[PDB]
Design a protein around this ligand. Sequence first.
Ligand SMILES: Cn1cc(-c2ccc(C(=O)Nc3cc(-c4ccccc4)ccc3N)nc2)c2cc[nH]c2c1=O
Length: 125
Amino acid sequence: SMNPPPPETSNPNKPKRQTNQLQYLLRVVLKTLWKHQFAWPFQQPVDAVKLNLPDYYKIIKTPMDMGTIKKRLENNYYWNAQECIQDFNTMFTNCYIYNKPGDDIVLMAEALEKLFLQKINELPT
Ligand SMILES: Cn1cc(-c2ccc(C(=O)Nc3cc(-c4ccccc4)ccc3N)nc2)c2cc[nH]c2c1=O
């Protein structure tokens, strides 16, 4: 297909372990962004077929979205908080390098990124 398989969200042989930062990433960061008015373009992988973006996966080499991030957190996929932060950053980068700077999608991404950074700056140690 035009669309890749979605990113893996299960880590079957990794031990399950909570950390304060991962709890924060799920219960504060992801929860706040997931419920935001502008979350909808970002809650699932970009469907280049339905959205008619035949070049999307030519430009975007590392697809990422909040649906994948949510599942990863809910499955304890990440070994540490920085991996999860990196996925958020990748999501936003993809949006900013593919879409035109004036597009409404970019304005929505910036509002979410602002909120993301606001929450990340209060990440527990
Ligand atoms: C990251 N990213 C994402 C999307 C994306 C992803 C999903 C949608 C989607 O679901 N639209 C939708 C919206 C409505 C709706 C919403 C609000 C009010 C009324 C109607 C209804 C149906 C559909 N289908 N749109 C754009 C996208 C496009 C171009 N570039 C990107 C991009 O980089």
